[PDB]
Design a protein around this nucleic acid. Structure first.
Length: 58
RNA sequence: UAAUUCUAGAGCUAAUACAUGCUUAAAAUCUCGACCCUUUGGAAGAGAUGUAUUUAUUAGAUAAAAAAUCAAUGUCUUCGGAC
C-alpha cells in the first residue's frame, strides 16, 4: 500500500511504500478527518502528527 | 485502475463570474404636533412620499329649462353674505 504524504508548509510532498501488516492497522476503522501518530508505524516518524484526506481502492 | 471524453490529495492568481455597497436640483403636499392666548385662532419643530410585489376602498362626468330653500363662504362688502 502506498502512502501519499504531503507537508503544506514547505509545500513538498513524497510518496511512501510499506509492506507489513501490523504497522497499518492504526489507520484502520477511521473516517477521514482525524489524526494518528507516526510512532505507531515509524521509527522515522517519532512525534509526527498526521491527518487522512482521501484514497483509492484496488 | 486491464480498462472510457474516469479522476484524488497538496500548492498559487483574475472577471461584464459570485457576494456586497455610497453619491444629487429645487419645489409642493400631507399628517403629527413645542408653544401662543385667544378669538372664528395660528404655530416652531418633526416625519412621510421613486419604481416593483399583494389586498381593500374612491375618480374614471355627459340627453332640455327656472325658482323656493338650509347655511357656509371667492369677492364690491351692499358684513346682507346675495353672488
Amino acid at each position: 500500500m502506498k502512502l501519499n504524504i504531503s507537508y503544506p508548509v514547505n509545500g513538498s510532498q513524497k510518496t511512501f511504500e510499506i509492506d507489513d501488516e501490523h504497522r497499518i492497522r492504526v489507520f484502520f476503522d477511521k473516517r477521514i478527518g482525524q489524526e494518528v501518530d507516526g510512532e505507531a508505524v515509524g521509527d522515522e516518524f517519532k512525534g509526527y502528527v498526521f491527518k487522512i484526506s482521501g484514497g483509492n481502492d484496488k
